Design a protein around this nucleic acid. Structure first.
Lengths: 510, 342, 336
DNA sequence: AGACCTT
DNA sequence: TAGACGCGGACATCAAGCCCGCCGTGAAGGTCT
């Protein structure tokens, strides 16, 4: 809200150029109006003097950018990804689940190609006319609209170029256009009950990318910089703050307290799984421990391997015990592709974040009988969030089943860990979390569930052919538990509950 | 052919190679490193010459004799240690038999039949010795066995009933393919790899253990990061062992050491990283380019033709199962076989 | 001949740190330690009583130039009652100069390979390999600790080898010239194991050097220093639970590789480099305007092939020794 | 095929 | 086995903390015309 105070403090030219590009608080073009609309009609090449950009076939390149406005960014984080997605959150979320339903959606931006970045001015910038915070292209699509005789303040635009702006922009602002094949989109599949499965593709909202960037640019204990190498192809959001992408570092180096201070059934243990090089970029906005929907898929791909032998396993829950944690940048070398002109080189360069988790699991199934010794090793999966999953040879003698979960935490032969739950306090913005993250500096954030944009629908090339929606990411908060003598296990032993538009994983106490 | 989505996933997966220092009184501490700055000298070609001769006039005989600082990392064997030991683990499975993606039936039943008819006709005794000679040689250390006195591999199989099979001094004894075969545990560990590939849900696990004797204060070479941006060079990939920093020597760098078996390309001197364009990293060239006709997608498009050759008793095997040894190498490690996308 | 956009070699010589030890008349050995002490000196800089291109400034009066400068330095001396000093390191000699390491051009790779091969056959390794062994066997890797000392002695143990330890004694009087090492019982046997390391492929030789220094009472030791208040900070590692100065890993490689005395003035052996820089004075002999640097001899390598096919004259030999000495050092010869 | 392309 | 473990008073002044110079390069684009 710095309109004329920031217009002439006599600093420099590009103070305004940093102020319309949507990684900044807005301005409100109310008092001085014609001197600002002569800027956006002069931000196309890279006042009232460098004209002939007004009443020509300039509008043919100016109308094509309003179709590509991208509520969500389908090119995040891989460059070659065709798609147009512009739809709001489709529903609502409860009090302790941060997502982009909790912040208002007004930072959408052109992401198609390189040439039309500057020519995507004049209809994709947002300027807060008198009331509404609004853009410029979702306003000039009707006749009885003000600040349009100020288009006739410039004596160039004849009223037959008005006759195209009448009827060109008519019905645009609700579409979703992704085709699953041939495309570089990611997609997974998750159970919705014990009968079917729902496919879903996570995307990246560039309102949460804007919001976390322009609020974390002056605290360094809580921000980790992640760069990319072709900023123009990603769109103007990754060009304005070019490369940088401040995103929510873990908060402190990991601390290992003593584990526990103690003196139906079907509790199975898995001691000290070691993971080599799992990714840490869980959500598009957080860095740290991986998303706990990957701890869910590690369990559900394990219970399907045993059901190949006895088809009544029904794992029903799981419990996580983190002993070591280590995050750093390492770089993932992608290999040679056929580029497209005539050559064989590598694809585009990025930064990554990789992790190293030593953890152990408790599993509360219903199978009230012994499993085996041999095929309980052969049925283990070999990956956890793009990583490896190995144990030992000599730790195959600590794998046992039990029927009482208070002797089950005695079977872990390490005793230097930590347990995990969810923090049930309201987190309506980013400022709620960092206030709780500076009182503790021992709490982690990750993606705990998804959030649909769709009912869902049957799409042709969906992965395993099930049913395909499009989802967001649900930020949550992760806690430390000692399990002394009195903490009930309902704050442990998480599950998947399917709340009809969001698939959040939370423990079974709520 | 080549439908719009087809994918496998890998059948060999290693872990990282953590380093430890051993002391003469049989004690074990992890190996560490710390950063170090140094004074180099102006030696780049683009500081004196600009383009095609024409030396720069603003870079005279005193400007070139400056110094330029650059910061590096540095790791060495500490004084008064015995040797280095290098823990590591491998595994084997059978995921080359069934595809991970679908939606074309005529290539799904063809690519599972071709595995069945390669299995019984010309079995797994060719590939499973090449994958095991790379582990048991010391190819997975990449640079630490050069300028070294001796090294010794000791490997623990699973499921095994016997003593830990170990290979002694490799620079003198285990030279060629012969002396690996004249060991009293060799046919029991190749055949348990043959059991892993050829069984529906079979598994094999090897824990490998090296002992590395080096000279006094000799350096150690781990893997390096790939971050894109006093301009620090040589930042090491690391982990935390015992609350201490430790260089790890890769996780995908070890999968590239084991799968260096491809010597079936038109010149065929040195083995290559197994891939579809057959790229040599120390060159920029591509052996098996997509104009020679010997890249992977021009050998996968005779998959019904190699059905019609394996049935005949007259198998040529001079340059027609080298096209099938190469084809079955890319199914064990490959898994994104898709033409126009992804 | 023209050189590509990706070219690189690795080393062939690889030395390490020089750990120091104190030896007692009981015949036991401890590490050497140091301490930081602070000092008090004078106002004795010219930029402290004068003006820039001018006259003496009128703030530096007779009083204010007689105050004290306090400064903290490090300091390391031999303790009282010790006998001598013990030093140790090791050098490997590979052959990684035969073929390049990263080349991207099949035409210049054939030239660099057949130039090393024609070098081996006509002008052998008796001239280069003697020069690197010459510096290891008279303590040029100590740099200033043999200055103002009574006597130092060097004992080698090579690999692979069967026999006894090589030893050179009293290096101020006995081992001075080039003939003084030839007149030995053990000299020819160690030169053909450096040549066989270079000439053959997969060829290796490891030397492991140890020396003894005799200094006067409480004399001062001068190790390597760090790059960055504290003037004169020393380079440290941990030797059996203490802190000790190390005399550096790259610095002892820069004393093995002072063999260059073929430059157009030819007075003092220089450190081998691409442009031949000097640090006693801050100029460059072998500047590119002289036509004697690396990148002007590398681009004429096709010419040197048909000189080696009658013996070459003198300067074509002295530029082939300089070309081979930069490939042993080899250092990412990219351009454009 | 090549022209476009910003912090 | 039963007990107790002291009051009373000051912790000085003074000066200062130099300069020298540098901070390497090759490879990895999607899209409309």
């Amino acid at each position: 809200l710095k309109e004329l105070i920031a217009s002439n403090p006599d600093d420099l030219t590009t103070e305004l150029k940093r102020a319309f590009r949507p990684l900044t608080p807005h301005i409100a073009i109310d008092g001085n109006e014609l001197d600002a609309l002569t800027i956006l009609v002069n931000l196309t090449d890279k006042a009232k003097c460098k004209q002939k950009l007004r009443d020509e076939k300039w509008w043919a390149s100016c109308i094509n950018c309003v179709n590509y406005r991208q509520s969500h960014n389908p090119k995040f984080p891989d460059i070659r990804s065709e798609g147009v997605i512009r739809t709001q959150a489709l529903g609502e979320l409860p009090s302790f689940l941060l997502s982009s339903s909790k912040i208002p959606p007004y930072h959408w931006s052109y992401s198609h190609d390189s040439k039309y970045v500057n020519k995507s001015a004049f209809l994709t910038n947002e300027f807060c006319w008198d009331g509404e915070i609004s853009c410029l292209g979702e306003l000039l699509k009707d006749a009885d609209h003000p600040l349009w005789n100020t288009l006739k303040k410039l004596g160039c635009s004849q009223k037959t170029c008005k006759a195209m702006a009448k009827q060109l922009a008519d019905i645009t602002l609700t579409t979703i256009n992704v085709t699953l094949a041939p495309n570089y989109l990611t997609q997974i599949s998750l159970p919705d009950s014990d009968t079917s499965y729902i496919s879903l593709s996570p995307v990246a909202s560039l309102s949460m990318q804007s919001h976390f960037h322009q609020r974390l640019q002056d605290e360094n204990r809580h921000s980790a910089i992640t760069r990319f190498s072709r900023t123009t192809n990603m769109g103007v959001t990754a060009m304005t703050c070019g490369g940088a992408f401040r995103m929510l570092k873990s908060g402190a180096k990991f601390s290992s307290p003593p584990h526990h201070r103690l003196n139906n059934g079907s509790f199975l243990v898995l001691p000290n799984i070691r993971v080599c090089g799992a990714t840490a970029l869980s959500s598009p906005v957080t860095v740290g421990i991986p998303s706990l929907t990957a701890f869910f898929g590690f369990v559900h791909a394990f219970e399907r391997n045993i059901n190949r032998t006895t088809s009544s396993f029904r794992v029903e829950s799981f419990a996580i015990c983190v002993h070591q944690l280590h995050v750093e940048k390492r770089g993932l070398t992608a290999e040679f592709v056929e580029k497209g002109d005539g050559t064989i080189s590598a694809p585009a360069t990025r930064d990554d974040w990789q992790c190293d988790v030593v953890f152990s699991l408790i599993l509360n199934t219903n199978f009230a009988q012994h499993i085996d010794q041999d095929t309980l090793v052969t049925s283990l999966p070999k990956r956890l969030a793009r990583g490896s999953a190995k144990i030992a040879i000599d730790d195959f003698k600590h794998i046992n089943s039990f029927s009482t979960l208070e002797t089950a935490i005695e079977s872990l032969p390490i005793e230097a860990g930590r347990w995990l739950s969810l923090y049930a306090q309201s987190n309506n913005n980013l400022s709620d979390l960092l206030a709780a993250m500076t009182e503790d500096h021992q709490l982690m954030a990750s993606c705990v569930g998804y959030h649909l944009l769709e009912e869902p629908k049957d799409k042709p090339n969906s992965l395993r052919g099930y049913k395909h929606a499009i989802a967001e990411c649900i930020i949550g908060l992760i806690n430390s538990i000692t399990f002394s003598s009195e903490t009930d296990p309902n704050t442990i032993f998480w599950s998947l509950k399917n709340y009809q538009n969001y698939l959040v994983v939370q423990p079974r106490s709520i | 052919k080549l439908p719009t989505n087809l994918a496998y996933e890998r059948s060999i997966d290693p872990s990282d190679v953590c380093f430890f220092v051993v002391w003469p009184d049989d004690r074990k501490t992890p190996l560490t490193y710390n950063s170090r700055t140094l004074l180099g000298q102006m030696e780049a070609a683009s500081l004196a010459y600009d383009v095609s001769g024409q030396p720069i006039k603003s870079a005279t005989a005193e400007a070139l004799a400056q110094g330029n600082p650059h910061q590096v990392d540095f790791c060495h064997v500490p004084y008064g240690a015995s040797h280095i030991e290098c823990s590591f683990s491998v595994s084997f499975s059978s995921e080359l038999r069934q595809p991970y993606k679908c939606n074309s039936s005529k290539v799904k039943q063809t690519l599972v039949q071709l595995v069945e008819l390669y299995e019984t006709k010309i079995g797994w005794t060719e590939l499973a010795t090449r994958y095991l000679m790379n582990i048991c040689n010391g190819k997975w250390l990449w640079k630490n066995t050069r300028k070294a006195y001796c090294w010794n591999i000791v490997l623990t199989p699973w499921p095994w009933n016997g003593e830990k099979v170990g290979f002694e001094d490799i620079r003198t004894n285990y030279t060629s393919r012969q002396d690996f075969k004249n060991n009293k545990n060799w046919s029991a560990i190749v055949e348990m790899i043959k059991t892993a590939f050829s069984s529906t849900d079979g598994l094999a696990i090897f824990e490998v253990r090296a002992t590395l004797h080096l000279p006094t204060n000799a350096m150690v070479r781990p893997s390096q990061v790939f971050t894109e941006k006093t301009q620090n060079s040589r930042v090491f990939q690391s982990t935390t062992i015992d609350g201490e920093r430790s260089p790890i020597l890769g996780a995908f760098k070890t999968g590239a050491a084991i799968a260096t078996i491809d010597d079936w390309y038109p010149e065929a001197t040195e083995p290559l990283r197994v891939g579809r364009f057959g790229v040599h990293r120390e060159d920029v060239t591509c052996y098996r380019h997509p104009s020679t006709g010997k890249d992977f997608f021009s050998i996968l498009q005779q998959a019904e033709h190699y059905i019609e050759v394996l049935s005949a008793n007259k198998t040529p095997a001079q340059e027609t199962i080298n096209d099938m040894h190469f084809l079955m190498a890319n199914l064990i490690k490959g898994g994104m076989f898709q033409h126009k996308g992804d």
